[PDB]
């Protein structure tokens, strides 16, 4: 078999897990009671917990099945490795090794590369495999250039746009976003900001929406500048300059409904559109839609074919 190491951020399974999860995010430094209360309040606002654990499972095992149903050159076996709760990246590599997996392909459920995200997933996976003696991990770094990925988002955007009155489409803007990172990554030409711009450009040329902008969301609690503009601020700025009637938010750096979409878009961006008198749109996330499982199947199968 070939191991398929499918990686993602992780989410609390239970309300009681929030403290240890947030501590892991903060590199072992326990957050304060006020920080914990803020995060717990956001989870409460979206219904109590996030759907990300179930979606991530459906993505990983749906990918495994799409691959195995489409060819008989190899058998893939999926192992889920999460960044900040069990099963951790290291636990997934240990499981492959214990099962006798000799070779693996890895994919992060985030289509863009950065030094804070995919690089860190890959370093941890490689370091765990090195200590164990295997498996050899063949990492996919990014996959936003996949045409089926771009077309999936364009199709969702066009479906939403077709329900906007034709006389208001000229007053509609597409806001393309991803998770913000510290601005300092630009100092060393990290590819992440340019990958998001390329993604926005590729999508724009396949949709009927005539206006678009790139923003960022979910910047952390630090004392340094992060990539912007923030999507809330950008919404205000664009309404100020152009008086758009419809804002369509596609946080294409993410692949699932989770806290950073359900709260940071569907609550925080809608607060702004409500304040200025515009309509809020946020198309369905890829989740485990068959189209999205086909994107991932294409990516992994191309990777496997290029290794051989």
Binding residues: 9, 26, 42-43, 50, 121, 179, 260
* Contact between residue 258 and residue 84 where contact means Cβ atoms under 8 Å apart: no
170, β-bridge pairs: none
Kindly tell me which of 22 and 153 has the beta carbon lying closer to ligand HT9.
22
Q: How, if at all, do strands 2-8 and 76-82 pair?
A: parallel
Kindly tell me which of 98 and 221 has the beta carbon lying closer to ligand HT9.
221
* Contact between residue 304 and residue 105 where contact means Cβ atoms under 8 Å apart: yes
- Which span sits near ligand HT9 by CB under 6 A: 19-27, 138-146, 204-212, 277-285? 19-27
3-class SS of residue 170 = coil
Kindly tell me which of 219 and 294 has the beta carbon lying closer to ligand HT9.
219
Q: Rounded to the nearest whole angstrom, what is the least distance from the CB of residue 104 to ligand HT9 in the complex?
A: 19
Kindly tell me which of 164 and 176 has the beta carbon lying closer to ligand HT9.
176
Q: How many residues bind ligand HT9 (CB under 6 A)?
A: 20
List 4, 5, 6, 52, residue binding ligand HT9 (CB under 6 A): 52
Structure token digits, residue 88 = 């951790």
Q: Rounded to the nearest whole angstrom, what is the least distance from the CB of residue 270 to ligand HT9 in the complex?
A: 18
Q: Rounded to the nearest whole angstrom, what is the least distance from the CB of residue 259 to ligand HT9 in the complex?
A: 3
* Contact between residue 177 and residue 231 where contact means Cβ atoms under 8 Å apart: yes
- Under rule CB under 6 A, residue 13 binds ligand HT9: no
Q: How far apart are CA 60 and CA 108, in angstroms?
A: 10
| HSE-up (13 A, CA, CB side) for residue 159 | 10
- Under rule CB under 6 A, residue 97 binds ligand HT9: no
Q: Rounded to the nearest whole angstrom, what is the least distance from the CB of residue 99 to ligand HT9 in the complex?
A: 25
Residues 258-287, interacting with ligand HT9 (CB under 6 A): 258-260
Residues 6+ apart with CB under 8 A from 251: 176, 177, 178, 217, 260, 261, 264, 265, 285
- Under rule CB under 6 A, residue 220 binds ligand HT9: yes
Residues 6+ apart with CB under 8 A from 196: 112, 176, 177, 178, 214, 252, 253
- Under rule CB under 6 A, residue 1 binds ligand HT9: no
Kindly tell me which of 56 and 273 has the beta carbon lying closer to ligand HT9.
56
- Under rule CB under 6 A, residue 230 binds ligand HT9: no
Q: How far apart are CA 249 and CA 269, in angstroms?
A: 9
Give contact residues for ligand HT9 (rule: CB under 6 A): 8-9, 11, 22, 25-26, 39, 50, 52, 110, 116-117, 179, 181, 220-221, 253, 258-260
């Amino acid at each position: 078999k070939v191991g398929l190491l499918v990686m993602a951020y992780g989410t609390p399974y239970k309300d009681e897990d929030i403290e240890r999860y947030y501590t892991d995010i903060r590199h072992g430094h326990k957050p304060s009671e006020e920080m914990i209360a803020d995060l717990r309040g956001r989870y409460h606002a979206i219904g109590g917990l996030s759907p990300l654990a179930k979606i991530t499972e459906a993505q990983a095992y749906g990918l495994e099945k799409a691959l195995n149903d489409s060819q008989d050159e190899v058998e893939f076996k999926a192992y889920i490795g999460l960044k900040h709760i069990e099963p951790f990246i290291e636990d997934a590599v240990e499981a492959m090794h214990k099962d006798g997996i000799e070779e693996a392909i890895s994919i992060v459920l985030a289509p863009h590369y950065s030094s804070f995200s995919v690089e860190a997933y890959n370093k941890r996976a490689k370091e765990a495999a090195d200590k164990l003696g295997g498996p050899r991990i063949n990492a996919i770094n990014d996959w936003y250039k996949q045409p089926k990925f771009i077309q999936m988002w364009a199709d969702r955007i066009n479906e939403t746009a077709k329900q906007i009155p034709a006389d208001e489409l000229l007053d509609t803007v597409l806001i393309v976003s991803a998770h913000s990172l510290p601005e300092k990554i630009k100092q060393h030409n990290d590819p992440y900001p340019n990958q998001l711009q390329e993604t926005a450009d590729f999508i724009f040329e396949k949709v009927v929406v005539p206006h678009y902008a790139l923003g960022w969301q979910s910047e952390g609690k630090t004392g340094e500048p992060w990539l912007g503009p923030d999507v809330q601020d950008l919404t205000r700025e664009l309404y100020g300059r152009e008086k758009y009637k419809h804002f369509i938010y596609t946080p294409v750096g993410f692949v699932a409904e989770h806290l950073e979409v359900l709260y940071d878009n569907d609550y925080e961006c809608k607060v702004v559109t409500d304040e200025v008198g515009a309509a809020y749109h946020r198309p369905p996330m890829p989740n485990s839609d068959p189209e999205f499982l086909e994107v991932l199947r294409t990516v992994v199968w191309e990777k496997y074919s290029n290794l051989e």
